[PDB]
Each structure stands twice: as structure tokens, then as C-alpha cells.
Amino acid sequence: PLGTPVPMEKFGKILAIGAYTGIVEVYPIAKAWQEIGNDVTTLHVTFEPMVILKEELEKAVTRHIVEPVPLNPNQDFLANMKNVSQRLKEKVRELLWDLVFMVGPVGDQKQVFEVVKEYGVPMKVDLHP
Amino acid sequence: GPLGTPVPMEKFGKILAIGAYTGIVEVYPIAKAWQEIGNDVTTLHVTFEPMVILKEELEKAVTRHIVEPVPDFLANMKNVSQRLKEKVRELLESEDWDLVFMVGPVGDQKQVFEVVKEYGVPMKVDL
Amino acid sequence: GPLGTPVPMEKFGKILAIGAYTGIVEVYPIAKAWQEIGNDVTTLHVTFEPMVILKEELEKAVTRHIVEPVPLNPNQDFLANMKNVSQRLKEKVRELLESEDWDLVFMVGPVGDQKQVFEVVKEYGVPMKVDL
Amino acid sequence: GPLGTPVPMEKFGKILAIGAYTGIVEVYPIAKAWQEIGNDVTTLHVTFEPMVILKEELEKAVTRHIVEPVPLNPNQDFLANMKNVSQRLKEKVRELLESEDWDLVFMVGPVGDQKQVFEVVKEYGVPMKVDL
Amino acid sequence: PLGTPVPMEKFGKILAIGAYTGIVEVYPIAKAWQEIGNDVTTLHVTFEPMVILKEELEKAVTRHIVEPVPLNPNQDFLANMKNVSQRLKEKVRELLEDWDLVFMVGPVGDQKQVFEVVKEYGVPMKVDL
Amino acid sequence: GPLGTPVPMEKFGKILAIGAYTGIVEVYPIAKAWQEIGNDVTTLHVTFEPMVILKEELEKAVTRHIVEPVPLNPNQDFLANMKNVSQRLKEKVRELLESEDWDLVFMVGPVGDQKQVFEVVKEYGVPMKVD
Numbered sequence: 001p002l003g004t005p006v007p008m009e010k011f012g013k014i015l016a017i018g019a020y021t022g023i024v025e026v027y028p029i030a031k032a033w034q035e036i037g038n039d040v041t042t043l044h045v046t047f048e049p050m051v052i053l054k055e056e057l058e059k060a061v062t063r064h065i066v067e068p069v070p071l072n073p074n075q076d077f078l079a080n081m082k083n084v085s086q087r088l089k090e091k092v093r094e095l096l097w098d099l100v101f102m103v104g105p106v107g108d109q110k111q112v113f114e115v116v117k118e119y120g121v122p123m124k125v126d127l128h129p
Numbered sequence: 130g131p132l133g134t135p136v137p138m139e140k141f142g143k144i145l146a147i148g149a150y151t152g153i154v155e156v157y158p159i160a161k162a163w164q165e166i167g168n169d170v171t172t173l174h175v176t177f178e179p180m181v182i183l184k185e186e187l188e189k190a191v192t193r194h195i196v197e198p199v200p201d202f203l204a205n206m207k208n209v210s211q212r213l214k215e216k217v218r219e220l221l222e223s224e225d226w227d228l229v230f231m232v233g234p235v236g237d238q239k240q241v242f243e244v245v246k247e248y249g250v251p252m253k254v255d256l
Numbered sequence: 257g258p259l260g261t262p263v264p265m266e267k268f269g270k271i272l273a274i275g276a277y278t279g280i281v282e283v284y285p286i287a288k289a290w291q292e293i294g295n296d297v298t299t300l301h302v303t304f305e306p307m308v309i310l311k312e313e314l315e316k317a318v319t320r321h322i323v324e325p326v327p328l329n330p331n332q333d334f335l336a337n338m339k340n341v342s343q344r345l346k347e348k349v350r351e352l353l354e355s356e357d358w359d360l361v362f363m364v365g366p367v368g369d370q371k372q373v374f375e376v377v378k379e380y381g382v383p384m385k386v387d388l
Numbered sequence: 389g390p391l392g393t394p395v396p397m398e399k400f401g402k403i404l405a406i407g408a409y410t411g412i413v414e415v416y417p418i419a420k421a422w423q424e425i426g427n428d429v430t431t432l433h434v435t436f437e438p439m440v441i442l443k444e445e446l447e448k449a450v451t452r453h454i455v456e457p458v459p460l461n462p463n464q465d466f467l468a469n470m471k472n473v474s475q476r477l478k479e480k481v482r483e484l485l486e487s488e489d490w491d492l493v494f495m496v497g498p499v500g501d502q503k504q505v506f507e508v509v510k511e512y513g514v515p516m517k518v519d520l
Numbered sequence: 521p522l523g524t525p526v527p528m529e530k531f532g533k534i535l536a537i538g539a540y541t542g543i544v545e546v547y548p549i550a551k552a553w554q555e556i557g558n559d560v561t562t563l564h565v566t567f568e569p570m571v572i573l574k575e576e577l578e579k580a581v582t583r584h585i586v587e588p589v590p591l592n593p594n595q596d597f598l599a600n601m602k603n604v605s606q607r608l609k610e611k612v613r614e615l616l617e618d619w620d621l622v623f624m625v626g627p628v629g630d631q632k633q634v635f636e637v638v639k640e641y642g643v644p645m646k647v648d649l
Numbered sequence: 650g651p652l653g654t655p656v657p658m659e660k661f662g663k664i665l666a667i668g669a670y671t672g673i674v675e676v677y678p679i680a681k682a683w684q685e686i687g688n689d690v691t692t693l694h695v696t697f698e699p700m701v702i703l704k705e706e707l708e709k710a711v712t713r714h715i716v717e718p719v720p721l722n723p724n725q726d727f728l729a730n731m732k733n734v735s736q737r738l739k740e741k742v743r744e745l746l747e748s749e750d751w752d753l754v755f756m757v758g759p760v761g762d763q764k765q766v767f768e769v770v771k772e773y774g775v776p777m778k779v780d
Contacts, residue, residue, distance in 0.1 A: 001238040001255050008678040009653050021206070021234045028658040032682035050202045077182045083152065103716040105151040106255075109131040113157055115132070126130045128235055128254045129657075132264040138285040139260050158265045162289035257508075258489075258502045258518050277410055278470065278498040306462035334441045338410065347512040367519075370390040378389065386390050387499075388520045391527040397548040398523050417528040421552035521763045521779050526697070541731065541759045542672055572727040597702035627671040628653050635650040647651045649780070 004103060004126045008032065012098030014040040016061070017112065019088060020050065020102025025126070026103050027053050045088045045096075046081070046091035047071040067091055085111055097121045134232060134255040138162065142227035144170040145220055146191070149213060149233025150180065154256065156232050157183050161190040173220070177205070198205045199246045205242065210237055214244055223240065228253065261364060261387040265289065267340070269359030270351060271297040273318070274373060276345060276365025277307065282387070283364050283383040284310050288317040302351070306330045324348055342369050349373050353380045360385065389410050393496060393519040397421065401491030403429040404484060405450070406505065408477060408497025409439065415496050416442050420449040432484070434477045436460035436469070456480050462514070474504055485512045490516070524625060524648040528552065532620030534560040535542065536581070537634065539608065539626025540570065546625050547573050553578035561615070565607050567591045567600070576645055605630050612637050619643055654757060654780040658682065662752035663744060664690040666711070666716040667766065669738060669758025670700065675780065676757050693745070695738045697730070698732050699720050717741050735762050739769050746773045753778070 003025050015033040016030040023044040030042045038048075039105045046049065048068040069083050088108055092115045100116050102109060103126035116123050132156050136139040136243040146160040153174040153186045154242055173179065188194040197216050199209050220226070221244070229245050234253040245252050260282050273287040280301040287299045298320035300306065305325040315321040326341045349361075352374065363375050364387040375382060377384050392414050405419040412433040414461065419431045430452040437457040447453040458472045468477040484490075485508070493509050495502055509516050523545050536550040543564040550562045550599060561583035564571065566586040578584040589603045612622075612634050622638055625648040638645050653675050666680040673694040680692045691713040694701065698718040708714040719734045745751070746769070754762055754770055757780035770777045 001235060001242050003235050003659045005655045005657040007136045007652040007655040008682050025235050028660075028686045032658050032686055034684040036678050036682055052202050071179065073179060077180050081154075081182075106131065106133045107151075113130045127256055128238065129256060133266055135262040135264040137259040137262045138289050140285075158293050162265050162293055165292040166285045166289055257506045258499060260499050282499050307458070307466045309466040309470075328438060330438070334439045337439075340442065367390060367392050367414045368410070373389040393526045393530050396522040396525045397552050399548075421556055424555040425548050425552055476610050484547040516586050521760060521767045523760050544731075545760055569721070569723070570727055572731075589700055591699065597700055601702075628651065628675045631651040639650065 001128050003128070004029065004124075005129060006124065008030070008036055010037045012038065014038050015092070015095060015097055015100040016040050016042040017088075017092070017100065017104065018042065018044045019102070020046045020127070022103040022105075023053060026101070026106065027057050027102065028047050030057055033126070039066065041095075043067065043091060045069070045084055045091065047084070052074035061110045065091070084108070087113060089115055092116065099124070102126070134159065136230070136253065138166055140167045142168065143225060144168050145217075145226050145229045146170050146172040147213075147217065147231035147233070148172065148174045148231065149209065149231070149237050150176045152232040152234075152255070153183060156230070157187050157190070159230065160187055164191045171220075173197065173216065175199070175216060177209065197253060210240060213237055217241055218244050221245060221250060224251055226250050231255075259264050261286065265293050266353075268296045269295065270357065271295050271360045271362060272349070272358055273297050273299040273343075273363065274349065274361065274363035275301045275342065276363070277303045277367045279363075279365040280310060283362070284314050284317070286362070287314055291318045294367065298322065299350075300345075300348060301322065302341055302348060304328065306334070306359065308333070322348070344378060345369060346372050350376050353377060353382065358382045362386070389404065393418065393469045394515065395494070397425055398509050399426045401427065402489065404481075404490055404493045405429050405431040406477075406481070406493065406495040406497070407431065407459050408473065411496040411498075411519075412442060415448050415494070416449070419446055423450045428455070430454065430484075431486070432456065432480060434458065434473055436473070444502065454480065454484075474501055477501060478504055478508055481508055484516065485486050490514045495519075524549070526623070528556050529574065530557045532558065533557045534558050535612075535619055535622040536560050536562040537608075537612070537622065537624035537626065538562065538564045539604065539624070539630050540566045542626040543573060544622075546623075547577050547580070549623070550577055551571055559574070561585065563615070565595065565604055565611065570612070572614065575649060585611070587625075601627075601629075605633055608634055609637050616643070617643050621646070624648075654679065656755070656778065658686055661688045662688065663750065664688050665742075665751050665754040666690050666692040667738075667742070667754065667758070668692065668694045669734065669762050670696045672757040672759075672780070673703060675709035676755070677707050677710070679755070680707055682712045689723070691715065691745075693717065693741060695719065695734055697734065697743065715741065731759075731761075735765050738762055739765055742766055744771050746770060746775060751775055754778070 016026050017028040030040050033040045040061045042057050042061050043065045045067040067087050069087050072080050096119045100123045109125050138199040146156050151163045160170050163170045170191045172187050172191050173195045175197040178200050229250050238254050273283050275283040287297050292296045297318045299314050300322045302324040305327050326344050361382050361384045370386050405415050419429050420427045421517040429450045431446050431450050432454045434456040456476050458476050493516045502518050524540045535606050538546040550560050553560045562577050563585045565587040589605050589607050608630050622645045631647050666676050668676040672778050680690050683690045690711045692707050693709050693715045693719040717737045719737050754777045
């Protein structure tokens with residue numbers, strides 16, 4: 001099982017999105033795209049106590065945005081995941097590019113896809129072969 | 130648009146549907162379907178204690194649903210990882226399986242794959 | 257070895273699962289699953305009269321199971337007989353589409369009949385998906 | 389729209405192009421081409437007696453075209469009649485792989501049947517490809 | 521590791537394009553398509569001293585066009601290629617009679633340049649793999 | 650539209666990025682990236698003498714860049730000339746896979762040559778991804 005195989009081309013301005021643990025797999029990809037000549041900005045949207053690699057890719061890409069959401073021990077997890085789904089859709093909307101990549105749970109990908117859909121900019125989803 | 134992991138609907142036999150963290154959400158319908166088609170699937174959700182979800186749902190959808198809740202975020206992940214390896218090992222160790230499907234972070238699949246591989250059991254990851 | 261057509265398990269909505277000839281065997285479990293997940297699938301089996309199979313099985317698995325048996329005319333070569341199944345089957349999908357709305361059309365059958373069924377469904381914007 | 393099984397055009401050598409039921413239609417052009425490119429392909433059509441088709445066409449397109457017509461008993465459920473085709477298929481494929489050598493084998497038919505043949509083929513260390 | 525797997529159907533008039541060594545892999549494909557009933561015309565665009573299989577596919581398809589470009593040894597290869605990349609777009613535009621399917625096997629770069637030109641005429645094109 | 654070979658960005662370790670003829674153009678960025686991510690990649694360009702390209706570029710992008718230029722012989726024609734490149738390919742690949750260990754080998758070139766190199770890499774048990 002390998003990370004999402006992706007093409008190494010100069011797409012231009014790229015928005016590398018990483019939901020939850022997905023940011024780990026996006027780090028190297030974003031890093032590479034930047035090194036090849038792309039102006040990529042990564043976005044990590046997870047729970048407050050789960051932010052990771054913030055420093056690493058902050059030095060690897062042009063701009064690294066972290067949107068930490070409070071892990072509410074009150075409501076149930078399904079509710080909490082719905083907040084991330086919210087923050088996630090919001091951010092991507094204001095941010096709006098030549099390409100947008102993302103690796104997170106299918107549910108959040110579809111949600112972000114419906115967004116990016118309204119602006120023509122192509123998107124790439126994760127793939128583990 | 131993007132869709133869940135496309136998977137074949139056949140009678141593989143005994144299947145271990147593994148879901149790490151949020152991945153369990155995507156596995157629920159798949160497991161549910163496989164069970165409905167005639168498979169004897171057992172789902173395994175390995176996440177952090179305050180993140181268990183759909184426990185009730187698939188508990189009624191499959192034959193057996195195992196939840197392994199785990200109490201910086203880096204060492205925390207290695208725990209979820211160890212428990213995931215440990216747990217999966219015992220499964221393949223205390224009974225036979227036909228197919229092992231998992232959806233979760235690549236790192237975790239790369240490791241889970243290693244253990245399952247040791248038993249000659251075919252695996253399928255979220256493609 | 258070769259596995260059945262890998263397909264996503266999502267709630268597409270109303271799905272038309274088409275099975276030409278022996279293809280219906282492979283579609284049975286798929287349709288069954290989609291229905292179980294929350295889809296309103298209707299299967300369509302178009303084969304020769306003496307080849308209808310699994311009629312009872314998926315009749316209980318999905319909301320509606322349509323069987324369109326076409327006679328194997330003994331006074332005609334298989335090429336003709338064959339072209340007849342294509343015909344009927346094409347009249348059926350068109351009849352289905354132009355009478356009810358759908359979200360997805362999945363069909364597993366001979367490449368020949370797939371290109372035909374598609375020539376129609378594309379006329380209604382409904383997305384289609386075949387085997388692999 | 390839907391296209392036939394995309395396949396590479398190389399000189400594999402001796403190829404056994406298998407077509408079960410209506411699948412032979414899709415294999416005809418493929419076999420024809422492989423032969424034209426320099427391959428020594430032999431096609432095998434295993435269907436029901438009253439369903440043999442294109443026999444003359446590919447008989448002129450490839451080196452050897454084998455037709456194995458199975459009796460279609462309209463008085464048995466199709467599940468039975470299908471077993472026969474299955475059996476015959478495993479028989480002839482075994483009989484062929486037992487006698488002569490082969491560099492490649494390609495098939496296009498029901499998934500269930502592709503599994504059966506495959507398991508046999510894999511016994512004689514010869515690579516195989518199936519439709520997609 | 522096999523040649524580009526391609527469908528054997530009667531698309532109609534097909535333009536089989538082969539850049540540089542790519543023509544070797546296209547030869548059998550074109551040959552086959554023609555044999556199946558297609559009216560394919562192959563195009564080989566390479567450097568003058570690299571034309572190959574000219575006679576072979578000249579007999580296999582309806583029309584085989586060879587566009588040889590000179591090799592200037594007083595500049596880097598990136599430049600010489602540009603000429604080849606120019607002849608490509610200049611020839612594909614010319615041929616764009618009425619076609620049903622265009623197929624090409626050659627350096628990715630040119631595959632994109634030929635794509636923009638063809639995309640213009642709403643003609644289906646398939647690359648290699 | 651058409652894009653370069655999509656490839657995973659992981660730390661495989663020591664990687665041999667092979668580029669035959671014009672294929673080296675497409676491999677350059679891939680190798681460059683893999684190196685940047687933490688891989689110890691060595692690129693190999695095997696083409697005709699008057700076709701070497703990007704030599705300077707990836708020489709600075711990866712740990713080691715090997716160029717094996719094969720002279721043209723206007724007598725053998727372009728048939729035995731290519732097969733003359735398939736020779737250098739197999740041989741160099743054989744020296745590398747034999748004098749060193751590699752975690753993965755990647756190549757982008759004419760399928761014909763991809764098969765050759767493959768039959769060679771299979772012998773030494775090394776994974777290999779194609780374009």
C-alpha cells in the first residue's frame with residue numbers, strides 16, 4: 001500500500017487539503033509540488049488536540065493554514081465530525097486556483113467537491129494502490 | 130463526484146472489515162452490504178476513546194463488531210497503531226479469514242498489511 | 257482470480273440494474289446490496305425465454321424485478337435472434353427512462369448490447385455504469 | 389461510450405482467444421487483429437448449440453477456430469444448462485493446454501465462468517487476461 | 521509492461537500519431553485498426569535521421585505521413601525538440617478532414633500540446649500507458 | 650488533459666530513475682521531487698550521443714545522474730541503433746542492480762525497452778514502476 005500516486009507537473013497555485021490524519025500523507029506531496037515550482041498552500045482541518053506537522057510543511061510550502069476545531073466531549077462524535085465538515089466547507093469557499101488536492105474521509109471529500117465544483121478548478125482525491 | 134471505495138459484491142466468506150479513525154464511516158455500508166449478500170463479516174473499529182461512532186448501527190448489520198478504543202498526537206497515533214497491529218494479529222490468530230478490507234490512513238494500512246500478509250490472507254484497501 | 261465488477265456502495269437513489277443474458281447472475285448480488293444500503297433499485301433481465309434465472313431471488317431482494325424473455329426463433333440464425341434481444345432490451349430501457357426518473361443505470365452484459373443501451377440512456381442525462 | 393476490452397497489440401506468440409456465449413462477438417475483432425499482427429491465435433467458442441455465431445468469419449481470420457456447442461435443454465433450469473457450458477469450457481481448455489503449448493490466453497464471458505477457466509489456466513503457468 | 525492496451529472497434533477515420541521512437545509502439549496498433557475496418561492514417565514526426573518503419577506501415581495503413589525535422593548540433597536538445605513540438609501542432613491542425621478518433625504515443629509534453637489543438641475540434645483523443 | 654506519470658510521494662529509499670531517449674524529460678521532475686522528499690535517487694539517461702538533455706539540471710537535483718550516450722551508426726540504420734541503446738540500458742542497469750541495493754526502480758521509455766529492463770530487474774527482486 002503506497003501513498004496517493006500523483007503527477008509531478010507545474011499546475012500553478014494548488015490547495016493541498018488534509019483532513020484529520022490525512023495531513024500526514026499530503027505533507028510529502030505538497031512539499032514536492034512546491035519544490036517542482038508550484039505555489040501550493042496546505043490546509044489542515046482537524047480537532048484542536050490533533051494538529052501535527054504544522055512546523056514541517058510551514059517551511060515546505062508557501063502558506064500552511066491550520067483550522068483547529070474543538071473536540072466537544074458534550075455532543076457525540078458524529079456531531080463533532082459535522083463541525084469539521086462545516087469548517088472545512090467554509091474555508092475552501094473563502095479561499096476561492098489551478099488545482100486542489102485533498103486526502104480525508106470520503107464524506108468530507110464529497111462535501112469539498114460540491115464546493116470546488118462551483119468554481120471550475122479541478123480537484124484530485126486520494127488513492128491507495 | 131468522489132465516491133466511496135468501489136468494491137466487488139461476492140461471497141468471499143469470512144471477512145474482516147477494518148476501520149481506523151473516521152474510516153469506519155466509509156466501511157459501515159460496505160460491511161453491511163457484504164453481510165447482506167451472504168458474507169460472514171466482522172468489523173473492527175480502532176480509534177480514540179472519545180471518537181467511537183456507528184457502534185450501534187453496524188452491530189446490527191454484521192455478525193460481530195469489535196471496537197478497540199484508545200485513550201503528543203504523535204505518540205498517540207503510535208498507540209492506535211500498536212493496538213491495531215496487536216488486535217488484527219489476534220484475529221488472524223484465533224480463526225480463519227477469507228478477505229481483509231481496510232480503510233484508514235496509509236501508514237496504518239502499510240502496517241496492518243504487514244501483519245495480515247504473514248497469514249496469506251488477501252487484503253483490499255480504499256482505492 | 258477475476259472478481260465481480262467492483263462497485264461503490266452509496267445511496268445513488270433510484271437505480272436501474274440491467275442484466276443481459278448470463279450477466280444477470282453477476283448483477284444479482286450488486287442490486288441486492290444497493291437495495292439493502294438504501295437504494296430503490298429495479299433490476300431488468302433481458303434474455304431468451306428458456307434462460308430466465310434467479311427471477312425469484314432478486315424479486316425478493318429489490319423493489320421491482322422486470323424480466324423480458326425473448327423467443328429463440330428456430331427459423332432464424334442466432335445473429336438475428338441475437339439482434340432481437342438487443343431490440344427488445346433497447347425498447348425497454350427507453351420505456352423505463354421515459355416514464356420515471358433515475359439517478360443511476362448499471363448494466364452488465366455483452367459489450368455489444370452495452371453500447372446500445374448507452375445510446376439511449378445518454379439521451380436522458382442519467383449516468384450509466386457498466387462492468388469491468 | 390462503452391468500448392470493447394482494450395488490449396495490447398504485441399506479438400505474444402500462440403494465443404487462445406476464448407469466447408463464452410455472446411462473448412465471442414467481442415473477441416472476434418481482437419483475435420482477428422492479433423493474428424494480423426503476427427500472433428498464432430486459435431479462438432474457442434463455447435455456447436449452446438442454437439447460438440453458434442460468426443463461425444465462418446473468424447474461421448478465416450485466425451489459424452484455428454474451435455466451436456464447442458453444448459446441448460441447450462430448455463426443460464432444465466438455466467442453472468443446470470449453464471453448468472454444462474462451464475464443464476465443457478474447463479474440458480476443452482484443459483484438453484488444449486494439455487496437448488499444445490501456449491504463450492497467452494484471453495477470455496471474455498460471464499465472470500463466474502472466467503473464474504473457473506482461470507483456475508485451470510493458472511495450472512499450466514500460462515498468463516491470462518480478461519475483459520474490462 | 522506491455523504496449524498501450526487499446527480497444528478494437530470501428531471508430532472510423534483514425535489519426536495515429538507517433539512522436540520520435542513512439543512510432544514503434546503505434547505501428548502494430550495502427551496496423552490492427554486498419555485490418556479491423558478503420559481508415560487510419562499514421563503520422564511520424566521525428567528528427568530527419570530517425571525516421572523508421574516508414575515502409576512497413578506505409579503498406580499497413582491507408583496513408584502514412586512522415587514529417588522529418590533537422591537536427592541542429594549547435595544548441596541544446598530542449599531546443600531541437602521545440603521544432604518537433606512545432607511540427608506536431610502544425611501538422612495536426614492541417615489534418616483537422618473529418619476524423620472520429622485521434623490517438624498518439626510520444627513524450628508527455630507533446631501529448632499536451634497536441635491535446636490543446638485537438639481539444640479545439642471536439643475530437644476524441646487517447647494517449648498511451 | 651494528459652498528464653505526466655502520476656506517482657506516489659513516499660520515502661522508498663534508494664531509487665533508480667531511468668529515462669530512455671526523450672523519456673528523461675518526464676522523469677526529471679519526478680526524480681527531483683523524490684530526492685527532495687528524502688529519497689536517495691540516482692537518475693540514468695540512456696540515449697543517442699547527440700540527444701543528451703537536462704544533464705546539468707538533474708545533476709543538481711539528485712544525488713547521482715548517470716548519462717550513457719550511445720553513438721549513432723548510419724550503417725546499422727535506426728533498427729540496430731535502437732537495439733544498440735537497449736544494450737547499454739540492460740548492461741548499466743545490470744551493473745547498478747548488481748553493485749548496489751535499491752528499494753525501487755522507475756523508468757519511462759519505449760515499452761520495448763521497458764520490457765527488457767524489466768526482465769533484468771525481476772532477476773534481482775526489485776520493485777519497478779512504469780510510466
